[PDB]
Amino acid sequence: ELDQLRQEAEQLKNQIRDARKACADATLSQITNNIDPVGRIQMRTRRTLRGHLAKIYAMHWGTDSRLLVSASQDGKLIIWDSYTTNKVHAIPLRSSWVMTCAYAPSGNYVACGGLDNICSIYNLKTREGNVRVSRELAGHTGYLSCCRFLDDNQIVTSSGDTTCALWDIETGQQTTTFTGHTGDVMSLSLAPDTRLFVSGACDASAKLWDVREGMCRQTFTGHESDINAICFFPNGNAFATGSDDATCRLFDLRADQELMTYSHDNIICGITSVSFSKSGRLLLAGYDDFNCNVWDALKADRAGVLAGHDNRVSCLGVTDDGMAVATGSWDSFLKIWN
Amino acid sequence: TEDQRNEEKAQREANKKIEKQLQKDKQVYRATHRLLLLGADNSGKSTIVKQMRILSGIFETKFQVDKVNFHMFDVGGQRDERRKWIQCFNDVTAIIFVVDSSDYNRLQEALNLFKSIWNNRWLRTISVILFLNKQDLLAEKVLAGKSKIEDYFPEFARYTTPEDATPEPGEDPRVTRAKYFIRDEFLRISTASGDGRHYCYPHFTCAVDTENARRIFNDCKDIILQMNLREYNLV
Amino acid sequence: QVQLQESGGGLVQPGGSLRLSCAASGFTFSNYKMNWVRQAPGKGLEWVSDISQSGASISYTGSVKGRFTISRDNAKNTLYLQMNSLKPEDTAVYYCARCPAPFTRDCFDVTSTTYAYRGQGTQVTV
Amino acid sequence: GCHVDSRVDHLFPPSLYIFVIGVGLPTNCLALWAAYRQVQQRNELGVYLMNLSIADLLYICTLPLWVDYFLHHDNWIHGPGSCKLFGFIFYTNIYISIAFLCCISVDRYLAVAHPLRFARLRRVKTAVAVSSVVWATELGANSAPLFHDELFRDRYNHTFCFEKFPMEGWVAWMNLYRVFVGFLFPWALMLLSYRGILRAVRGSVSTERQEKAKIKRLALSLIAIVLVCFAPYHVLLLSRSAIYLGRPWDCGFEERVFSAYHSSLAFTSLNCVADPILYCLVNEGARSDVAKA
Amino acid sequence: TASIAQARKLVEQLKMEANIDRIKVSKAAADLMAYCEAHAKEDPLLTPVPASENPFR
């Protein structure tokens, strides 16, 4: 019966391929062929933040466009003030192999995690006046790749054991678990309404999940190597993916098909971080050749280059009002561009 | 305005306190050496770690030689795939690679792992300290027969022992021949690439060796010496 | 979608010959190093041979050093394994394996319990 | 007594000083810039190098007036305070340069011979403290003619500025001190430091033969060029002072050695050109650094 | 049998994703372009801003 199951799977894959071929009416380039080019985009460094001792692995903006969180492999978590470059807090971590960090929308809690397979939560508004550990979430069998906040009481986690999870912070238990990937999940991004979320794995695939029911609705393919960056379009009906084959792609959700690809001949190194802008017209992506590129999503022609970092770029971030772009690289420096 | 300055003064004093603490932390952080331990299940990498220790998933070890502190890590709470979490250890002083020499059918896997580590994009500037374990088992294997290394490697029949060898006081020539043949196999691929950016240090060890800490100390001293030669324009 | 499909196989006797062909689809064929692996009953996966992007560098294991031959064809995106003088230690499932990253001289995971880019395999018996 | 020459040494020193001012200046500026970026890296060595350039810079800025001392070639029209300042700088800057070279040698020794020790002596703060101490000590020690005015009268100043044919009193003993403390001892420290560095390098197992040979050539050049450029002046000084203390009435000796003395004094001003090239330009990494500049 | 169960689950999931309603690419592309042009005025990174309002002077 196993051979029959394989034949049935192949036949249904053929039917799916025929359906996706039927859906593809016209190319994105043909529709976006007359719009004005963005032009030359030259940003300059406005603030340089120093104080970290080792390479920076992740960062996140607060929901005020003023406060920032940075994580480095030296084992420290620094909360800055971008306007005056004043360090607001410094937190020593128990484990120095930290791979992600997050900022709660309310602004009272901060989460972190890494190779220890544990998500740690710290409280910022303690009545005493000191940051302290509030709750540790455990249950993952692999390293944490990303973590995002839904409310003050719920969190979403993606691990290297090909699984994602939803946690209720108050009781510290898993409510739902999402499975189905073959390789390690590298990143995730929450929807604007916090009802769906997408995740890309090291099997050259991406999957869309519904938070409440806990099921996989759509899976997208097209890359030929590991996907190591993902985000969400401001509209909430598309997303962008970067892989190790040195090319970016844009995927939709109601068409269930790839839309656009960004590539160049001189680019051999892959992408590490991808972030959008407020309007949805600019795509910022950092590479391993020590700089970042600013692509125009609609035209798929490079419009800007950000240079100045002396090592591999690891993290990108954009404010909620689109007034600053923060880049963190392996040279222990955070740079703000406007 | 009064509130503005009344808050800026507090912000400045807090920043000064944090900066002082950060400098104090940097002083300690800059004087500690980090090492990453790699090997296979058959290889007794833990037992040497236990020996130096006596002398969450991630095993941690701290030891001290000549008032210099060394920190060793062991990642074992993950899956077989390791092409993503190994990029974290790119600023490590040196990688301690443990190899099983007694088993022949597992030697090709160790050679392939060593070759993959050698040619990595993010591991081209990190030296590797090679520990060939299980010398007694290899000696018992070759001496008693019933197992021919020629079957696994047909280049063992046209191999002659190099002259610049230092056999132990009491030892059969065949044992020395095979033992140095394994090291020659591992060192053949270590010299094809690498423009003097890293070097492989080979050593022979057993299950009762109590001298690995000094070996690592000397190798780290040589690595730091090379880095200082490059840094101080002495080349 | 990445696809690597084996072919060939059959029943032979000690001292026979049979060529194995792997077809590929879904990626550029010349940027990736390729390997041959086999899995025989009672043990785990093992490595056999590898070939580079162009066709110059070639490596075997000792147990098959003087017997088998590898080849690759970029025009037809095919991987060939010539196999002769068989001995009762070759019955296994044969997977052709891709290197995860392009334009690199090394890659880590080719022989793992679960690997993304592999083939179903073919069974050959002596 | 005898009538020795006074103004017959006016052929080589002017052209030689013209060569030094033409060449050693821009290279010193580039070396200063390179050292500044090196200390921007948080590297102590650049600090020392930086100071060295400044010292040499001063000497070069003092050079042109002395070429007027061989244009008017008499009467020193400019003034006495001109001597008390510029002659001080002219006969002092070489010892500052030697001290900074010795500091560089010791710092290099501390980083190759003992790579995991003395972590408190290899910071910018200690470098700044040591450099300030060196500057202050040298100035205070050599400021003898600046303070008072009677002591300076033992250096002529009636005409031809800083010279003395009938040397008498204390100038001979200052010359002995300047030849046995200002030249040999720092040179001995330099030689010992590089001997240690070469011994450490020869024991390295990860260094190929070519690099070791190149290191040996560079070290030998560094230890030999200083001696070649400084030896004759000091040897003439010591010989003159010694046999003068033998027979003060004997005046023929000063007749035999006057031209050799001023030629050697012309020759000694080549370390100011030697140092920037051999400490910045030669090394390929630092040349790529200059390209980055 | 475990592989049989895995194949069964894969097949169920595959028919689950084989029935999702879909629309043509032109509609999605047009909607995305219209959204991009709609919010163009409020993006400082795309449209420069006066130096008085920018907080990073």
PDB file of N, CA, C and O in Angstrom, chain A residues 185-232:
ATOM      1  N   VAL A 185      13.525  25.611  11.771  1.00  0.00           N
ATOM      2  CA  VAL A 185      12.849  26.878  11.520  1.00  0.00           C
ATOM      3  C   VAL A 185      13.783  28.012  11.916  1.00  0.00           C
ATOM      4  O   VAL A 185      14.351  28.007  13.014  1.00  0.00           O
ATOM      5  N   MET A 186      13.951  28.989  11.026  1.00  0.00           N
ATOM      6  CA  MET A 186      14.940  30.034  11.251  1.00  0.00           C
ATOM      7  C   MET A 186      14.350  31.363  11.702  1.00  0.00           C
ATOM      8  O   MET A 186      15.029  32.111  12.412  1.00  0.00           O
ATOM      9  N   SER A 187      13.118  31.686  11.319  1.00  0.00           N
ATOM     10  CA  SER A 187      12.530  32.962  11.700  1.00  0.00           C
ATOM     11  C   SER A 187      11.015  32.870  11.596  1.00  0.00           C
ATOM     12  O   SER A 187      10.467  31.947  10.991  1.00  0.00           O
ATOM     13  N   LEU A 188      10.344  33.847  12.204  1.00  0.00           N
ATOM     14  CA  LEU A 188       8.894  33.957  12.131  1.00  0.00           C
ATOM     15  C   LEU A 188       8.512  35.428  12.194  1.00  0.00           C
ATOM     16  O   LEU A 188       9.295  36.276  12.629  1.00  0.00           O
ATOM     17  N   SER A 189       7.293  35.724  11.749  1.00  0.00           N
ATOM     18  CA  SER A 189       6.785  37.089  11.752  1.00  0.00           C
ATOM     19  C   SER A 189       5.285  37.064  11.994  1.00  0.00           C
ATOM     20  O   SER A 189       4.564  36.307  11.340  1.00  0.00           O
ATOM     21  N   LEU A 190       4.824  37.894  12.925  1.00  0.00           N
ATOM     22  CA  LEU A 190       3.415  37.931  13.282  1.00  0.00           C
ATOM     23  C   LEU A 190       2.640  38.855  12.351  1.00  0.00           C
ATOM     24  O   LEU A 190       3.168  39.845  11.840  1.00  0.00           O
ATOM     25  N   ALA A 191       1.372  38.518  12.139  1.00  0.00           N
ATOM     26  CA  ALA A 191       0.499  39.337  11.321  1.00  0.00           C
ATOM     27  C   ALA A 191       0.157  40.637  12.046  1.00  0.00           C
ATOM     28  O   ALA A 191       0.270  40.723  13.271  1.00  0.00           O
ATOM     29  N   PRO A 192      -0.247  41.672  11.305  1.00  0.00           N
ATOM     30  CA  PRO A 192      -0.652  42.924  11.964  1.00  0.00           C
ATOM     31  C   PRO A 192      -1.796  42.754  12.948  1.00  0.00           C
ATOM     32  O   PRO A 192      -1.846  43.476  13.952  1.00  0.00           O
ATOM     33  N   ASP A 193      -2.720  41.831  12.693  1.00  0.00           N
ATOM     34  CA  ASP A 193      -3.835  41.573  13.595  1.00  0.00           C
ATOM     35  C   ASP A 193      -3.578  40.407  14.540  1.00  0.00           C
ATOM     36  O   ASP A 193      -4.476  40.041  15.305  1.00  0.00           O
ATOM     37  N   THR A 194      -2.378  39.822  14.507  1.00  0.00           N
ATOM     38  CA  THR A 194      -1.993  38.721  15.393  1.00  0.00           C
ATOM     39  C   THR A 194      -2.969  37.548  15.302  1.00  0.00           C
ATOM     40  O   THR A 194      -3.342  36.949  16.311  1.00  0.00           O
ATOM     41  N   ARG A 195      -3.386  37.215  14.079  1.00  0.00           N
ATOM     42  CA  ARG A 195      -4.236  36.057  13.850  1.00  0.00           C
ATOM     43  C   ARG A 195      -3.551  34.945  13.071  1.00  0.00           C
ATOM     44  O   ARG A 195      -3.971  33.789  13.180  1.00  0.00           O
ATOM     45  N   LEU A 196      -2.516  35.261  12.295  1.00  0.00           N
ATOM     46  CA  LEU A 196      -1.753  34.273  11.551  1.00  0.00           C
ATOM     47  C   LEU A 196      -0.274  34.582  11.713  1.00  0.00           C
ATOM     48  O   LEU A 196       0.106  35.689  12.103  1.00  0.00           O
ATOM     49  N   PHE A 197       0.567  33.594  11.417  1.00  0.00           N
ATOM     50  CA  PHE A 197       2.001  33.855  11.382  1.00  0.00           C
ATOM     51  C   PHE A 197       2.689  32.875  10.443  1.00  0.00           C
ATOM     52  O   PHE A 197       2.262  31.729  10.290  1.00  0.00           O
ATOM     53  N   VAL A 198       3.765  33.343   9.816  1.00  0.00           N
ATOM     54  CA  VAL A 198       4.477  32.592   8.792  1.00  0.00           C
ATOM     55  C   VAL A 198       5.861  32.231   9.317  1.00  0.00           C
ATOM     56  O   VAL A 198       6.414  32.912  10.186  1.00  0.00           O
ATOM     57  N   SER A 199       6.412  31.135   8.800  1.00  0.00           N
ATOM     58  CA  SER A 199       7.717  30.671   9.251  1.00  0.00           C
ATOM     59  C   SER A 199       8.466  30.009   8.102  1.00  0.00           C
ATOM     60  O   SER A 199       7.877  29.254   7.326  1.00  0.00           O
ATOM     61  N   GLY A 200       9.760  30.279   8.016  1.00  0.00           N
ATOM     62  CA  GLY A 200      10.614  29.688   6.995  1.00  0.00           C
ATOM     63  C   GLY A 200      11.624  28.745   7.616  1.00  0.00           C
ATOM     64  O   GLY A 200      12.157  29.021   8.694  1.00  0.00           O
ATOM     65  N   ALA A 201      11.885  27.631   6.934  1.00  0.00           N
ATOM     66  CA  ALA A 201      12.734  26.583   7.489  1.00  0.00           C
ATOM     67  C   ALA A 201      13.939  26.323   6.588  1.00  0.00           C
ATOM     68  O   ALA A 201      14.084  26.908   5.513  1.00  0.00           O
ATOM     69  N   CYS A 202      14.808  25.423   7.052  1.00  0.00           N
ATOM     70  CA  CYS A 202      15.995  25.003   6.320  1.00  0.00           C
ATOM     71  C   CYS A 202      15.721  23.857   5.355  1.00  0.00           C
ATOM     72  O   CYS A 202      16.656  23.154   4.961  1.00  0.00           O
ATOM     73  N   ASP A 203      14.461  23.641   4.982  1.00  0.00           N
ATOM     74  CA  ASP A 203      14.106  22.694   3.935  1.00  0.00           C
ATOM     75  C   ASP A 203      13.684  23.403   2.655  1.00  0.00           C
ATOM     76  O   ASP A 203      13.015  22.801   1.809  1.00  0.00           O
ATOM     77  N   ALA A 204      14.063  24.675   2.509  1.00  0.00           N
ATOM     78  CA  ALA A 204      13.686  25.506   1.365  1.00  0.00           C
ATOM     79  C   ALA A 204      12.167  25.620   1.242  1.00  0.00           C
ATOM     80  O   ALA A 204      11.593  25.463   0.163  1.00  0.00           O
ATOM     81  N   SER A 205      11.512  25.900   2.367  1.00  0.00           N
ATOM     82  CA  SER A 205      10.062  26.008   2.384  1.00  0.00           C
ATOM     83  C   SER A 205       9.626  27.010   3.442  1.00  0.00           C
ATOM     84  O   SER A 205      10.364  27.323   4.386  1.00  0.00           O
ATOM     85  N   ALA A 206       8.410  27.524   3.253  1.00  0.00           N
ATOM     86  CA  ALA A 206       7.761  28.414   4.203  1.00  0.00           C
ATOM     87  C   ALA A 206       6.330  27.947   4.420  1.00  0.00           C
ATOM     88  O   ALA A 206       5.709  27.379   3.523  1.00  0.00           O
ATOM     89  N   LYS A 207       5.812  28.182   5.621  1.00  0.00           N
ATOM     90  CA  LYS A 207       4.487  27.702   5.985  1.00  0.00           C
ATOM     91  C   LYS A 207       3.721  28.786   6.725  1.00  0.00           C
ATOM     92  O   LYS A 207       4.297  29.563   7.493  1.00  0.00           O
ATOM     93  N   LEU A 208       2.408  28.817   6.496  1.00  0.00           N
ATOM     94  CA  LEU A 208       1.510  29.765   7.143  1.00  0.00           C
ATOM     95  C   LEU A 208       0.652  29.035   8.167  1.00  0.00           C
ATOM     96  O   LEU A 208       0.056  28.001   7.853  1.00  0.00           O
ATOM     97  N   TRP A 209       0.578  29.579   9.382  1.00  0.00           N
ATOM     98  CA  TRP A 209      -0.128  28.955  10.491  1.00  0.00           C
ATOM     99  C   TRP A 209      -1.201  29.888  11.031  1.00  0.00           C
ATOM    100  O   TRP A 209      -1.002  31.107  11.105  1.00  0.00           O
ATOM    101  N   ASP A 210      -2.328  29.297  11.423  1.00  0.00           N
ATOM    102  CA  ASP A 210      -3.385  29.998  12.136  1.00  0.00           C
ATOM    103  C   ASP A 210      -3.203  29.744  13.627  1.00  0.00           C
ATOM    104  O   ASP A 210      -3.005  28.600  14.048  1.00  0.00           O
ATOM    105  N   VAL A 211      -3.273  30.814  14.421  1.00  0.00           N
ATOM    106  CA  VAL A 211      -2.868  30.732  15.822  1.00  0.00           C
ATOM    107  C   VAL A 211      -3.856  29.906  16.638  1.00  0.00           C
ATOM    108  O   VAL A 211      -3.456  29.075  17.462  1.00  0.00           O
ATOM    109  N   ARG A 212      -5.157  30.110  16.425  1.00  0.00           N
ATOM    110  CA  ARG A 212      -6.155  29.522  17.315  1.00  0.00           C
ATOM    111  C   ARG A 212      -6.350  28.031  17.055  1.00  0.00           C
ATOM    112  O   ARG A 212      -6.153  27.206  17.954  1.00  0.00           O
ATOM    113  N   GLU A 213      -6.748  27.666  15.834  1.00  0.00           N
ATOM    114  CA  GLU A 213      -7.011  26.262  15.535  1.00  0.00           C
ATOM    115  C   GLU A 213      -5.739  25.425  15.601  1.00  0.00           C
ATOM    116  O   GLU A 213      -5.772  24.271  16.042  1.00  0.00           O
ATOM    117  N   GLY A 214      -4.612  25.981  15.168  1.00  0.00           N
ATOM    118  CA  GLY A 214      -3.354  25.262  15.221  1.00  0.00           C
ATOM    119  C   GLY A 214      -3.170  24.286  14.080  1.00  0.00           C
ATOM    120  O   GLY A 214      -3.033  23.080  14.300  1.00  0.00           O
ATOM    121  N   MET A 215      -3.162  24.796  12.851  1.00  0.00           N
ATOM    122  CA  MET A 215      -3.021  23.956  11.673  1.00  0.00           C
ATOM    123  C   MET A 215      -2.260  24.726  10.605  1.00  0.00           C
ATOM    124  O   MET A 215      -2.185  25.957  10.634  1.00  0.00           O
ATOM    125  N   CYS A 216      -1.692  23.983   9.660  1.00  0.00           N
ATOM    126  CA  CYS A 216      -0.985  24.571   8.532  1.00  0.00           C
ATOM    127  C   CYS A 216      -1.954  24.731   7.370  1.00  0.00           C
ATOM    128  O   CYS A 216      -2.577  23.755   6.939  1.00  0.00           O
ATOM    129  N   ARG A 217      -2.078  25.956   6.864  1.00  0.00           N
ATOM    130  CA  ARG A 217      -3.001  26.231   5.772  1.00  0.00           C
ATOM    131  C   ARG A 217      -2.320  26.189   4.410  1.00  0.00           C
ATOM    132  O   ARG A 217      -2.863  25.602   3.468  1.00  0.00           O
ATOM    133  N   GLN A 218      -1.148  26.807   4.280  1.00  0.00           N
ATOM    134  CA  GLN A 218      -0.449  26.878   3.008  1.00  0.00           C
ATOM    135  C   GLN A 218       1.041  26.663   3.217  1.00  0.00           C
ATOM    136  O   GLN A 218       1.613  27.082   4.231  1.00  0.00           O
ATOM    137  N   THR A 219       1.666  26.007   2.237  1.00  0.00           N
ATOM    138  CA  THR A 219       3.112  25.850   2.181  1.00  0.00           C
ATOM    139  C   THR A 219       3.623  26.333   0.830  1.00  0.00           C
ATOM    140  O   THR A 219       3.019  26.057  -0.210  1.00  0.00           O
ATOM    141  N   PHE A 220       4.732  27.066   0.858  1.00  0.00           N
ATOM    142  CA  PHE A 220       5.321  27.681  -0.322  1.00  0.00           C
ATOM    143  C   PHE A 220       6.753  27.201  -0.493  1.00  0.00           C
ATOM    144  O   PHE A 220       7.503  27.083   0.485  1.00  0.00           O
ATOM    145  N   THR A 221       7.126  26.933  -1.744  1.00  0.00           N
ATOM    146  CA  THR A 221       8.460  26.484  -2.114  1.00  0.00           C
ATOM    147  C   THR A 221       8.972  27.345  -3.263  1.00  0.00           C
ATOM    148  O   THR A 221       8.262  28.205  -3.789  1.00  0.00           O
ATOM    149  N   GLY A 222      10.216  27.098  -3.664  1.00  0.00           N
ATOM    150  CA  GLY A 222      10.807  27.837  -4.761  1.00  0.00           C
ATOM    151  C   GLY A 222      12.281  28.129  -4.586  1.00  0.00           C
ATOM    152  O   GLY A 222      13.006  28.283  -5.573  1.00  0.00           O
ATOM    153  N   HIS A 223      12.742  28.209  -3.344  1.00  0.00           N
ATOM    154  CA  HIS A 223      14.163  28.385  -3.095  1.00  0.00           C
ATOM    155  C   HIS A 223      14.890  27.052  -3.240  1.00  0.00           C
ATOM    156  O   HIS A 223      14.283  25.979  -3.224  1.00  0.00           O
ATOM    157  N   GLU A 224      16.214  27.129  -3.385  1.00  0.00           N
ATOM    158  CA  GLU A 224      17.045  25.942  -3.557  1.00  0.00           C
ATOM    159  C   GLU A 224      18.050  25.766  -2.425  1.00  0.00           C
ATOM    160  O   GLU A 224      19.038  25.045  -2.589  1.00  0.00           O
ATOM    161  N   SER A 225      17.824  26.408  -1.286  1.00  0.00           N
ATOM    162  CA  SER A 225      18.687  26.255  -0.120  1.00  0.00           C
ATOM    163  C   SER A 225      17.913  26.725   1.108  1.00  0.00           C
ATOM    164  O   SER A 225      16.707  26.985   1.039  1.00  0.00           O
ATOM    165  N   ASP A 226      18.607  26.833   2.237  1.00  0.00           N
ATOM    166  CA  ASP A 226      17.959  27.200   3.490  1.00  0.00           C
ATOM    167  C   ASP A 226      17.458  28.638   3.451  1.00  0.00           C
ATOM    168  O   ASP A 226      18.139  29.537   2.952  1.00  0.00           O
ATOM    169  N   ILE A 227      16.264  28.852   3.995  1.00  0.00           N
ATOM    170  CA  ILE A 227      15.695  30.186   4.159  1.00  0.00           C
ATOM    171  C   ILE A 227      16.054  30.678   5.554  1.00  0.00           C
ATOM    172  O   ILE A 227      15.757  30.009   6.549  1.00  0.00           O
ATOM    173  N   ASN A 228      16.689  31.852   5.637  1.00  0.00           N
ATOM    174  CA  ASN A 228      17.192  32.330   6.920  1.00  0.00           C
ATOM    175  C   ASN A 228      16.709  33.736   7.258  1.00  0.00           C
ATOM    176  O   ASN A 228      17.337  34.419   8.072  1.00  0.00           O
ATOM    177  N   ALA A 229      15.605  34.180   6.663  1.00  0.00           N
ATOM    178  CA  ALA A 229      15.027  35.474   6.993  1.00  0.00           C
ATOM    179  C   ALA A 229      13.598  35.508   6.479  1.00  0.00           C
ATOM    180  O   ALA A 229      13.291  34.942   5.428  1.00  0.00           O
ATOM    181  N   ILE A 230      12.729  36.180   7.233  1.00  0.00           N
ATOM    182  CA  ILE A 230      11.325  36.296   6.860  1.00  0.00           C
ATOM    183  C   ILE A 230      10.743  37.501   7.580  1.00  0.00           C
ATOM    184  O   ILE A 230      11.226  37.901   8.642  1.00  0.00           O
ATOM    185  N   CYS A 231       9.717  38.095   6.983  1.00  0.00           N
ATOM    186  CA  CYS A 231       9.004  39.212   7.583  1.00  0.00           C
ATOM    187  C   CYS A 231       7.566  39.173   7.081  1.00  0.00           C
ATOM    188  O   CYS A 231       7.114  38.169   6.525  1.00  0.00           O
ATOM    189  N   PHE A 232       6.841  40.267   7.287  1.00  0.00           N
ATOM    190  CA  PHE A 232       5.468  40.392   6.823  1.00  0.00           C
ATOM    191  C   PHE A 232       5.283  41.742   6.152  1.00  0.00           C
ATOM    192  O   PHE A 232       5.762  42.763   6.650  1.00  0.00           O
TER     193      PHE A 232
END
